[PDB]
Amino acid sequence: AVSVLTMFRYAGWLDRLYMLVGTLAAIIHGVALPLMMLIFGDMTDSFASVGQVSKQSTQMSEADKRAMFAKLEEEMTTYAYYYTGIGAGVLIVAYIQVSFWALAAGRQIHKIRQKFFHAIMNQEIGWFDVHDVGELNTRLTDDVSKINEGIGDKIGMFFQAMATFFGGFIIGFTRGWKLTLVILAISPVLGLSAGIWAKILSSFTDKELHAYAKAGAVAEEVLAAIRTVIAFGGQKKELERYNNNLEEAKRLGIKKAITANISMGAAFLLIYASYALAFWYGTSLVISKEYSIGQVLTVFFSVLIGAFSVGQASPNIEAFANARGAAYEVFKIIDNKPSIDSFSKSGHKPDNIQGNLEFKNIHFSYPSRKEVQILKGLNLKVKSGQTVALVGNSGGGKSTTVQLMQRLYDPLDGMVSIDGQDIRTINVRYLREIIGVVSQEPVLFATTIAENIRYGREDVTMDEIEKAVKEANAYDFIMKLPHQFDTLVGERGAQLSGGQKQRIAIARALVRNPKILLLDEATSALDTESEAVVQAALDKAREGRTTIVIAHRLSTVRNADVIAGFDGGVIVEQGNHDELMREKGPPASFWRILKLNSTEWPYFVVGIFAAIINGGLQPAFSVIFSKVVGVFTNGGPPETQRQNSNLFSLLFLILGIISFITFFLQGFTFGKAGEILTKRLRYMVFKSMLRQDVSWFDDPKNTTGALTTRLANDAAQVKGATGSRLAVIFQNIANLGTGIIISLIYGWQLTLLLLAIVPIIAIAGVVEMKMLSGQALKDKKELEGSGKIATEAIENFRTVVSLTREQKFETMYAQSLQIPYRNAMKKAHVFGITFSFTQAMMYFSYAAAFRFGAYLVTQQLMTFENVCLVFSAIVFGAMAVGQVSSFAPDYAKATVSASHIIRIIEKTPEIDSYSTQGLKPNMLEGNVQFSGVVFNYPTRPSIPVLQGLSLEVKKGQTLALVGSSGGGKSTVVQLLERFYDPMAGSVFLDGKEIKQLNVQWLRAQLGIVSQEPILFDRSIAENIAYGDNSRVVSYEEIVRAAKEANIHQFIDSLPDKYNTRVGDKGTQLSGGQKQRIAIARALVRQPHILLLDEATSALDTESEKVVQEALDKAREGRTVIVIAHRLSTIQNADLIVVIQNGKVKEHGTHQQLLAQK
């Protein structure tokens, strides 16, 4: 499903030369760095030769060694010269490698995007039909961006890394006859351990995902019908399943975190064991006497650099593989032969045609389906100078005759002749330009009408084309109405009426001045005043040239002299219209409250201290590392060098073991702490959402899926925002600080030199990342114009086809893409120069460090063991800082954002709810009054619904309120349970207001029933028992409830009876009975008042007979307010008190017939 070796089809010879020089530049750099490393080994060998104790007399002999110290200084100067030469080479090669590879891509992308646009806009409409409009643009944008990035930088970097690893292993050929054997034999152990630990971690991650899946599902189902939840107030009764699922998820996550931490610790342990074994073997080899320690050190460093190179090569090859599929796809759009070309050489065209089309054997339909036939063959012919009208259900499905006229589609065996000759011989562009169309929707360009008229056809003169706009509504519509100055109209402001749009479309058609005109729904569903005027323009266009018309209303049929229309493919004559029947017509977190949220500092605190000792591993490492060189620096060869080397190897191994156990304890504490925090946050936040009022969920910004994702993925962000980060802070700062202090104790000059130079490279890297990001964002912003052109063109693709003026679109797209293309070349050189500059700064820092170290050694003030000590300590500490900060769990980024979102939603103060302050009366005489209360949706106060309503209810009355809009009326019911809060009026229940009430107690005494009976993923009984939340639990009273609701037969029919469970809609219950079980749930609460809006969800109308039976039984049992926009429901209601918007009272049907039907 991908392609390779052929994605560079459009590459030019200069482009291939650019690539050839670039890749060569990469091998050069990749070879150069291990050359630096080998010269470091020769550097350590020179120091070893100088620091030979030899005879005890020699120490103070030769003028205290002053002469050969001068020789050493000369050698050091030569080595520094070679160092800076290599640095300049690294800078010279880097500029060319990054710039050329990117430059070539810049040109490659410039060619490929233009070719893609040309092909896609040259494609036939049927291809677009089986596709969409937005996803074409999205595919274009993301695929070209990926290809650009990949073939711009990633391939060059990959060749660089591959060459680095190679050159390291060319050194490794010899230096590794003994060393590579052992080092590259212990490396596969590291690889296998990493692989098995990654597999175990992935298995644990999948297990915890499947464990949390149940919690996610229950969250989704409770949030979907949360209105029912707040109607029953089951939040307290809720969350136990959520709590248990989170408990299981937390327990599995503890194991997951333990596994990840032990995997990482094993990684450290294998690294350190490899170090120890390699140095043990190297010390033995150098002690053999035929070898120098510098060669061991340089081969070991070179193979480490090769490992670094292999590790760095992975993202680049991944990006290349990702871009391969996008390249294959984008090329697959290319090279597809369309049905028509419009640019073919075979374009013979007759001159001054009369348009006497003849039609025969028209068998064609939508190409998307080959089962339904729309055109069944029409033996129709037309004549010049006579307007023809088509009448029927539509234009043969949907104006498909028009699609036939200009070759939008390709009829099968459909023979159509414009004047007696086949359309195949005629040029596509000529055929399109000699034919004019009228769109059913006059949608236009987001720009001034002048260029729209220019788009219509070649403007001979602006005044001439303006004269052509002499159709009815001329001048007042073109100038008096659009700001008088010709103005950009379109989606971006300057809206005009549909009459203006149709009129300008007619004007464009007249500018085309075709021999044959096409009219498709000129005033389809337009204003009655908008029509009856543009039809005059249509008529005055029709006397000029022959045309076909399809009319929205039969009036044009009267206007048309010839009426040849039908439906179903049965051709009818056009002699007269008499046969035609009488058709009717958010700030960041303080980071301290977040930490304080973890009130579990004991199981926390040790980890910090544990982390601290971990920070001591890195510099202490270098210490023993330096001492290894200290073995073979100035000292006595035979007394203890073997024993000293063995002792320091044992120190390496015990250091690795203590690091392993340290990181084990670190994991065992931070994982547990983070897991307990994850559980605590989820437990609190879920209660927070169930606590929030209905309005909070109504806001369209937050949706059920959005809140579920908030519960799902806004925890791992905290896992790393709270406990792992402080561990990173403490370990990193302890490492760097102890390295600096040991440097200061063991060094006085070069220590500060390194401490000063490393920050400038760090800030250079940071600023060049910042500049790359800024340039990328600037480019994405300034391609917005080209994106706008592409979107506007593709959205109006049918209009583009209907209008021959199409190459102009390619022209503006090319210009608005080449300006960013020029910006791309300008960015390429800058990117290359900065990357080369930072590499040169790194190499220069290295060279200066070595020069100063050697110079101060010539002063005889710090021994090589100390110079190498401080240098390796600081550099490896900085490397550890970098690796740990990247191995760190994404602190900030999307984590602190989700953290403050979690804090906001938890601390959200909603309208008072679940508040115990609400007064609760012992008994309710159902004294509900609804007089003088006005309110609407808080999210959209645009419509002040519920205006001037007066209503009052006593015990036993059946209030059959029936407003014209059921959904609008639903709000009146929604107010009784305070889903929304009234402000204009007050509602009094039992003679006292409802706002000063125990929300739950009010809800408790309210048997609401929703029109849509959504129930949970629980059993038939577990759902009916949900009504008695915070109440007496129903034990076998459910039998009485079902008997009262008369659904006993269906509960009895179920195999497990009450136990039968509605599991993920398995054994799905009948549509006409879910409302019944909801009614049973409502009557379980046994309230003094019930609310019903059942209406009729489905069309079964049989269980519907049973549902009003249950409703009348309930209403004779207890007082009820029933809402139903159904004639049968209101007629069945004995107490007909139908009132709409407060206009009438009591029985409307007796007062007036308006209520009836």
Ligand SMILES: C[C@@H]1NC(=O)c2csc(n2)[C@H](CS)NC(=O)c2csc(n2)[C@H](C)NC(=O)c2csc1n2
């Ligand atoms: C897994 C990841 N490492 C690599 O991807 C990697 C590729 S090559 C390489 N390491 C070389 C030879 S394997 N290593 C050293 O030169 C070295 C000297 S000290 C030191 N590492 C300290 C102990 N390491 C970390 O703190 C640490 C945290 S994460 C991490 N390393």
